[PDB]
Amino acid sequence: SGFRKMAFPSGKVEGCMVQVTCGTTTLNGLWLDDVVYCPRHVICTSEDMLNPNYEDLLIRKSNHNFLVQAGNVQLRVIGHSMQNCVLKLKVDTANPKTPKYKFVRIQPGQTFSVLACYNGSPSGVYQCAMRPNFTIKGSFLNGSCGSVGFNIDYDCVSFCYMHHMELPTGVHAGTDLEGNFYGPFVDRQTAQAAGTDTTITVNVLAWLYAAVINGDRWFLNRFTTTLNDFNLVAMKYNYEPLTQDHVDILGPLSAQTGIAVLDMCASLKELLQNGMNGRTILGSALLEDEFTPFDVVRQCSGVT
Amino acid sequence: SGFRKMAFPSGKVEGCMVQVTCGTTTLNGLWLDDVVYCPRHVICTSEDMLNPNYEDLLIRKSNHNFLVQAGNVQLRVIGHSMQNCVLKLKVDTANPKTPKYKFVRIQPGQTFSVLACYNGSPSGVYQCAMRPNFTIKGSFLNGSCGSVGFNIDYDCVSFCYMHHMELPTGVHAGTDLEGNFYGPFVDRQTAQAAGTDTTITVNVLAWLYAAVINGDRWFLNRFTTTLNDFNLVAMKYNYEPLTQDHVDILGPLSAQTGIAVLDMCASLKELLQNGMNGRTILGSALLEDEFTPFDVVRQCSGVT
Ligand SMILES: Cc1ccncc1NC(=O)Cc1cccc(O)c1
Ligand SMILES: Cc1ccncc1NC(=O)Cc1cccc(O)c1
């Protein structure tokens, strides 16, 4: 009973967080095996950020300039290298708390937990969706760079995001763990357009199934629709076009509840055209798109 | 930039979770020092739950009947006792992962993180408020009993809740770590009235301050109100009456933003009387009451 915006337990990730200082800048690093990963802008001063020549800035740095501290212990840096927008600092000690892990590049519309950190210390954990425009609407202040996003399948942490930047619009940008930015963003102090965003249709449908499973059924109607008809409505309301692949991923939820995907699409169509009429669904007064069909199945069954 | 329903990092609590089995029932236990805490209904069968005589049911149990497993290792039970609705199983080994901790009884309107667990394994973490009627709107399925709520001040975990029960209405009930239920609830399979709930006024005001700090300002108006006038509106809309003590706790947020508490009350009064007019605040289409003034200050400053 009940449905919450649930994050993964952050324990395996807390054990990997470290503080990285270079010159006067301090941010967070991710210590896995004998490598510490952090945003490459740790080597910049606030003045350098207009248009930094990272290659030139890193050439002035040596292993001993990167101060890496795991809580209270100091790590010895024996190598440094830049891969895309991340720095990899080789340390002489493998992190004893390194969990089984993978580095994954998630797709837009997928979700993940963020362990927000400051000075190498965890402050909190929250669940995010990677927007269709490759930004995340997180909660990050100065010093949060290097905080990571992740998913966990049993004992394996799949790291998918590292926080790098806040856009002038207050939304967030970052990279995969190979330092490749999601979206068109550059690690520079310049105005950067985030693309037109859309609502993640398949996630809203998955969340409508979670509502039905939990007893919120008022939005169910006597109608049905087709992919073509629904997509004309999705277009008008800036929703992602629904594909057969999206319908296929909704299969388990359609099977458990006995509500065909296109019938749930007709409920979503009516909610888009008429609003909620001052009512709520799972404690929300808007259509939630931060739960994937997998998240709904996991939460509704109790997967640990 | 940004504001999220953030939970505490759950790492220190994950290290304390164990599985407790007695007879045919399995649930979660909290292992701190050499004691494992769990709901006393672990000793019941589904048939016993109509009106269990817990004293009599526990008399038929011996130390060896409580199977306690921490992941893959088996704990040796050397004592058992019932305190209110919790069982305390003394084990021969102190948990090496026991953090600095306290047991606290939180007040209604206060918030905390829940580490949902099944079979002693963590599934996810979310932030909750203890409702004014002493229920929590969580996300719990069968097997989640024994999952705990907590807050963390630097390195100290203050355990405030242990999950025991789901009411016929789909809301949740539980105890403090001394086994005292929050609210009038009993650990029986009987219909139990949850009191009339109200919205946590001071939390909604704190969240309006968080909105202003983050740039959502459209609801700010040219009006002011008094405690008496605002409370006539709070009464009509089932909001908790605002007291000078609530105003006093809002002081830091009033000081940081320069918006007097009664002026923010006039914005809340207008939002109650007129609705959001199809707009949102911090990504919500309703008035959020699950962030305390302390939560807002902590998140807005970056406390770890
Ligand atoms: C201040 C802040 C708040 C929340 N999240 C991140 C930040 N920091 C930055 O954006 C640092 C930066 C990174 C690339 C380019 C820059 O010019 C500046
Ligand atoms: C099934 C479930 C779902 C979510 N949270 C908890 C539960 N379990 C219970 O309520 C067990 C119980 C506890 C006291 C009395 C009872 O009759 C039954």
DSSP letters for B226-252:
-HHHHHHHHHHTTBPPP-HHHHHHTHH
**Helix (H, G, I), strand (E, B), or coil: what is residue A278?**
coil
C-beta of A142 in contact with ligand 1 (< 6 A): yes
CB-CB under 8 Å, A124 with B6: yes
Which of A38, A41, A160, A246 is catalytic? The answer is A41
Which residues of chain A neighbour B298 with C-beta distances below 8 Å? Answer: 123
- B174 CA → ligand 2 middle, Å: 10
Cβ of A304 and B118 within 8 Å?
A: yes
- Other Cβ atoms less than 10 A from the Cβ of A60: the count is 9
> Among B150, B36, B48, which Cα is nearest to B88's?
B36
Kindly state the tokens that stand for B120: 């002693």
Look up residue A207 and give its amino acid: W
Instruction: Indicate the resolution in Å.
Output: 1.5
In sequence order, what are the residues at sequence separation of 6 or more whose Cβ sits closer than 8 angstroms to the Cβ of residue B75?
B18, B31, B36, B68, B69, B91, B92, B93
Amino acid A88 reads K
Q: Which residues of A touch B302 (CB under 8 A)?
A: 118, 123, 141, 143-144
For residue B117, give both structure tokens: 């667990």
C-alpha B161/C-alpha B126 separation (Å) is 13
- Which numeric CATH code is attached to A1-14+100-197? 2.40.10.10
CB B113 within 8 A of CB A4: no
Among B141, B110, B121, residue whose Cα is nearest residue B20: B121
Q: Which two structure tokens, joined as six digits, stand for A149?
A: 């996003």
Dig out the tokens for B131 from the structure: 């409702």
Q: Dig out the tokens for A125 from the structure.
A: 């954990």
Residues in chain A: 304
Termini Cα distance of chain A: 17
**What count of other Cβ atoms lies within 10 Å of the Cβ of residue A199?**
19
d(CA B85, CA B93): 24
Q: Which of B145, B160, B164, B265 is catalytic?
A: B145
Distances (CA, A) of B223 to A144, B206, B219, B257: 37, 18, 11, 17
Cα atoms in the 13 Å half-sphere on the side-chain side of B149: 29
CATH of B198-301, one of 3.20.20.30, 1.10.10.10, 1.10.1840.10, 2.40.30.200: 1.10.1840.10
Cα separation of B221 and B210, whole Å? 16
Check the CA dihedral B28-B32-B36-B42 and report its sign.
negative
Other beta carbons less than 10 A from residue B285's beta carbon? 17
The full DSSP string for A249-277 is: HTHHHHHHHT--HHHHHHHHHHHHHH--T
Compute the half-sphere exposure of residue B208: CA atoms within 13 Å on the CB side of its CA: 29
Residue B89 in tokens: 């199983």
Helix A201-213 × helix A261-274 angle, to 10°: 100
The Cα-based distances of A149 to A172, A214, A289, B64, B192 in angstroms read 12, 28, 18, 43, 41
**Chain Cα centroid distance, residue B156:** 17
- Coil, strand, or helix at residue A242? coil
Instruction: Kindly give, in sequence order, each residue whose CB lies less than 8 Å from that of residue A260, ignoring residues fewer than 6 positions away.
Output: A224, A254
Quick check: CB of B185 below 6 Å from ligand 2? no
Question: Helices in chain A by DSSP H: which ranges?
Answer: 11-14, 54-59, 201-213, 227-236, 244-249, 251-257, 261-274, 293-301
User: CA end-to-end span of chain B, whole Å?
Assistant: 17
What homologous superfamily does CATH list for A15-99?
Trypsin-like serine proteases (2.40.10.10)
Tokens of B184: 């009038």
Alpha-carbon distance of B126 to B132, in angstroms, equals: 19
DSSP state of A7: B
Q: How far is A59 from chain B (nearest CA, A)?
A: 32
CA distance A73 to B157: 23
Q: Where in chain A is the domain with CATH 1.10.1840.10?
A: 198-301
CB within 8 Å of B113: residues ≥ 6 apart: B7, B8, B10, B125, B126, B127, B128, B149, B150, B151
DSSP assignments along A212-228, one per residue: HHTT--TT--S----HH
Tell me if B140 CB under 6 Å of ligand 2: yes
Q: Which method was used? A: X-ray
Enumerate the β-bridge partners of residue B22.
B25, B66
Q: Cα–Cα distance between B304 and B294 in angstroms, integer?
A: 13
Between CA B89 and CA B92 the distance in angstroms is 10
| Single-letter residue type at A224 | T
Query: Does residue A265 have an active-site annotation?
Result: no
What is d(CA B240, CA B108) in angstroms, rounded to the nearest whole number?
11
Question: Is A80 tagged catalytic?
Answer: no
Q: What angle do CA B39, B43, B49 make, to 5 degrees?
A: 85
Q: Within an 8 Å CB–CB cutoff, is residue A121 touching chain B? A: yes
Calculate how far, in angstroms, residue A198's C-alpha sits from the geometric centre of ligand 2: 40
The answer to whether A95 touches A32, Cβ cutoff 8 Å, is yes
Q: Residues of B95-124 as b/e, b for ≥16 C-beta within 10 angstroms?
A: bebbbebeebebebbbbbbbbbbbbbbbbb
Instruction: Answer whether A95's CB lies under 8 Å from A29's CB.
Output: no
Taking CB atoms and an 8 Å cutoff, what residues of chain A touch B275? 278
Domain ranges in chain A with CATH number 2.40.10.10: 1-14+100-197, 15-99
Closest CA to B13 of B119, B192, B152, B134: B152
